[PDB]
Design an enzyme around this catalytic site. Structure first.
Site, PDB file in Angstrom:
ATOM      1  N   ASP A   1       0.804  -1.220   0.000  1.00 42.37           N
ATOM      2  CA  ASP A   1       0.000   0.000   0.000  1.00 42.37           C
ATOM      3  C   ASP A   1       0.843   1.278   0.000  1.00 42.37           C
ATOM      4  O   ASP A   1       0.272   2.363   0.154  1.00 42.37           O
ATOM      5  CB  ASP A   1      -0.952   0.007   1.201  1.00 42.37           C
TER       6      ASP A   1
ATOM      7  N   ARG B   1       0.987   6.848   0.029  1.00 39.00           N
ATOM      8  CA  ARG B   1       0.238   5.845   0.772  1.00 39.00           C
ATOM      9  C   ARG B   1      -1.109   5.691   0.072  1.00 39.00           C
ATOM     10  O   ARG B   1      -1.816   6.674  -0.197  1.00 39.00           O
ATOM     11  CB  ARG B   1       0.077   6.283   2.229  1.00 39.00           C
TER      12      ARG B   1
ATOM     13  N   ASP C   1      -5.898  -1.004   3.804  1.00 43.35           N
ATOM     14  CA  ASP C   1      -4.830  -1.603   4.573  1.00 43.35           C
ATOM     15  C   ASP C   1      -4.441  -2.962   3.990  1.00 43.35           C
ATOM     16  O   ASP C   1      -5.314  -3.835   4.028  1.00 43.35           O
ATOM     17  CB  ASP C   1      -5.207  -1.853   6.034  1.00 43.35           C
ATOM     18  N   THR C   2      -3.215  -3.103   3.528  1.00 45.55           N
ATOM     19  CA  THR C   2      -2.766  -4.419   3.072  1.00 45.55           C
ATOM     20  C   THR C   2      -1.936  -5.062   4.174  1.00 45.55           C
ATOM     21  O   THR C   2      -1.404  -4.340   5.014  1.00 45.55           O
ATOM     22  CB  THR C   2      -1.918  -4.403   1.796  1.00 45.55           C
TER      23      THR C   2
ATOM     24  N   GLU D   1       1.408  -6.228   5.661  1.00 46.15           N
ATOM     25  CA  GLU D   1       2.666  -5.685   5.143  1.00 46.15           C
ATOM     26  C   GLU D   1       3.812  -6.685   5.259  1.00 46.15           C
ATOM     27  O   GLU D   1       3.707  -7.686   5.947  1.00 46.15           O
ATOM     28  CB  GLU D   1       3.039  -4.394   5.862  1.00 46.15           C
TER      29      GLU D   1
ATOM     30  N   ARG E   1       3.921  11.366   3.489  1.00 45.12           N
ATOM     31  CA  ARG E   1       3.470  10.603   2.314  1.00 45.12           C
ATOM     32  C   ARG E   1       2.242  11.229   1.680  1.00 45.12           C
ATOM     33  O   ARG E   1       1.319  11.692   2.366  1.00 45.12           O
ATOM     34  CB  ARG E   1       3.146   9.174   2.758  1.00 45.12           C
TER      35      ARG E   1
END
EC number: 3.1.31.1
Length: 135
Positions: free
Chosen positions: A15, A29, A34-35, A37, A81
């Protein structure tokens, strides 16, 4: 909202990606997702993290055109980000990850939530199909 061109520098995670935007290198971002990580010790490599990360990477590396789309609220987070929807040949990467069961819809912060319902829709389908994270 409007889409603006960008160029891939490096995919860092599922992400988070580094892009050339208005001539400057910037870390983005992906908004509202939400992946799992690969990056963080308290975690390590979570399950489906390498998968989420290769998916984002392939989708961007194989694109003809990459575009970023900022939402209505703030455009950077506290780490500097950029906060955006990222498109590969017109397809939203944030949605593609959720539709594949490779990300969850994040905790949403108004007013950065324009594509929220669209994303929740795709997440309910991935859940219904029991894909990856929902398998």
């Amino acid at each position: 909202l409007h889409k603006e061109p960008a160029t891939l520098i490096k995919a860092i995670d599922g992400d988070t990606v580094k892009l050339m935007y208005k001539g400057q290198p910037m870390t983005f971002r992906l908004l509202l997702v939400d992946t799992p990580e690969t990056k963080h010790p308290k975690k390590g490599v979570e399950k489906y993290g390498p998968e989420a990360s290769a998916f984002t990477k392939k989708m961007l590396e194989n694109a003809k055109k990459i575009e970023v789309e900022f939402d209505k609220g703030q455009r950077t987070d506290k780490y500097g980000r950029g906060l955006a929807y990222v498109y590969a040949d017109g397809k939203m990467v944030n949605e593609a990850l959720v539709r594949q069961g490779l990300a969850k819809v994040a905790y949403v912060y108004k007013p950065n939530n324009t594509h929220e319902q669209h994303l929740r829709k795709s997440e309910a389908q991935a859940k219904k199909e029991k894909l990856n994270i929902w398998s």
